[PDB]
Paper text:
Leucine-rich repeat kinase 2 (LRRK2) is one of the most commonly mutated genes in familial Parkinson’s disease (PD). The carboxy-terminal half contains LRRK2’s enzymatic domains—both a Roco family GTPase (Ras-of-complex or ROC domain) and a kinase—as well as a scaffolding domain (C-terminal of ROC, or COR) and a WD40 domain. In vitro, the catalytic half of LRRK2 alone can bind to microtubules. Here, we report cryo-EM structures of microtubule-bound filaments formed by LRRK2RCKW.
Unlike WT LRRK2RCKW and LRRK2RCKW-G2019S, LRRK2RCKW-I2020T showed this additional layer line in the absence of MLi-2 as well. Given these observations, we chose the LRRK2RCKW-I2020T filaments that formed in the presence of MLi-2 for our cryo-EM work. The ROC domain points towards and contacts the microtubule. In contrast, our cryo-EM map showed clear density connecting LRRK2RCKW and the microtubule. The fact that microtubules are directional polymers, with ‘+’ (fast-growing) and ‘–’ (slow-growing) ends, means that the ROC domains, which would otherwise be related by a twofold symmetry axis perpendicular to the microtubule, are in different local environments. In agreement with this, their connections to the microtubule became apparent only when LRRK2RCKW monomers were refined individually. The higher resolution of our map, and our ability to process LRRK2RCKW monomers individually, allowed us to circumvent the symmetry mismatch between the LRRK2 filaments and the microtubule, and show that LRRK2RCKW monomers related by (pseudo) twofold symmetry in the filament are indeed not truly symmetric and interact with the microtubule differently. A sequence alignment of LRRK1 and LRRK2 revealed several basic patches in LRRK2’s ROC domain that are not well conserved in LRRK1. These basic patches create a positively charged surface facing the microtubule that is absent in LRRK1. The patches correspond to residues 1356–1359 (KTKK in human LRRK2), 1383–1386 (KRKR in human LRRK2), and 1499–1502 (KLRK in human LRRK2). In our highest resolution maps, in which we refined individual LRRK2RCKW monomers in the filament and their contacts with the microtubule, the strongest density connecting LRRK2RCKW to tubulin involves the 1356–1359 and 1383–1386 basic patches.
Author numbering: 1332 to 1525
C-alpha cells in the first residue's frame, strides 16, 4: 500500500487551481482565468518513481478551497500521515506570510505532521523586491518557528509553466513522501487487509 496524503492549502487568490492542473499535466489552449474551489475535494497523483527497478507512489491530494468556510470549520482534515504544501502568493511580498500565519489554527491545534514546502506562485507578476521580502519574512517567521514545526523549505514557482518551476516540487514532495514514517512505519508501502 504505497499511498500517502497531501494537503494543498492557501488563501484564495494564491493560484492553487493552475498549479495543480499544470502538475497533473494539463497544458495550453485552455482557460487561463481558472475558477476557485469550494469544498474540500481529493484526487489521485500516481507519480512514477525510478531506480534500477521501477517503483511508484500515489498520493491522496486534498484540494482545499482558500476560503474560511472550508478551513476554520473543518479541523478534521489534519493528519500525521500527510504532507503539507502551502500555496503562497509572491505578488503581495511579505504580506502574504502574515496572511498565511493564522493557518496554525488547524495545523497546530490538531496534531499534524510533516509540512514540507511553500510554493511561491505569481512569480511571473511579482517583483524581485517582493520575492526577497517574501523569503526574508518566510524565513524570519515560519522557517524559524511558526509556532509548530513549520521549519522546512520553499520554492518560488512560475506555476503557470512546468519546466523546473514544477519539476522541483514534484521531486521535493515525492522524496519526502517516499521516506516518511509514522510510528516508524513507512507510510508509502504498508501491509493492509483489503
Ligand atoms: N499570472 C499567474 N496567474 C496564476 C498563477 N497561478 C494561478 N493563477 C491565477 O489563479 C486563479 C484561480 O484562483 P485560486 O486561488 O486557484 O482559487 P482557490 O482554489 O480558492 O485557491 C486563476 O484565475 C489565475 O488567474 C501564477 O502563478 N501566475
Amino acid at each position: 500500500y504505497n499511498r500517502m496524503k497531501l494537503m494543498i492549502v492557501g488563501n484564495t487568490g494564491s493560484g492553487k487551481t493552475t498549479l495543480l492542473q499544470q502538475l497533473m499535466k494539463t497544458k495550453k489552449s485552455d482557460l487561463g482565468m481558472q475558477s476557485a474551489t469550494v469544498g474540500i475535494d481529493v484526487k489521485d497523483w500516481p507519480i512514477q518513481i525510478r531506480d534500477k527497478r521501477k517503483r511508484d507512489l500515489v498520493l491522496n491530494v486534498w484540494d482545499f478551497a482558500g476560503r474560511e468556510e472550508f478551513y476554520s470549520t473543518h479541523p478534521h482534515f489534519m493528519t500525521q500521515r500527510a504532507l503539507y504544501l502551502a500555496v503562497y502568493d509572491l505578488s503581495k511580498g511579505q504580506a502574504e506570510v502574515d496572511a498565511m500565519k493564522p493557518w496554525l489554527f488547524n495545523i497546530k491545534a490538531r496534531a499534524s505532521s510533516s509540512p514540507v514546502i511553500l510554493v511561491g506562485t505569481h512569480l511571473d507578476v511579482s517583483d524581485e523586491k517582493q520575492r526577497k521580502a517574501c523569503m526574508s519574512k518566510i524565513t524570519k517567521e515560519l522557517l524559524n518557528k511558526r509556532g509548530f514545526p513549520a521549519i522546512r523549505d520553499y520554492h518560488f514557482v512560475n506555476a503557470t509553466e512546468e519546466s523546473d518551476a514544477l519539476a522541483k516540487l514534484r521531486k521535493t514532495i515525492i522524496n519526502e513522501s517516499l521516506n516518511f514514517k509514522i510510528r516508524d512505519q513507512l507510510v508509502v508501502g504498508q501491509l493492509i487487509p483489503d
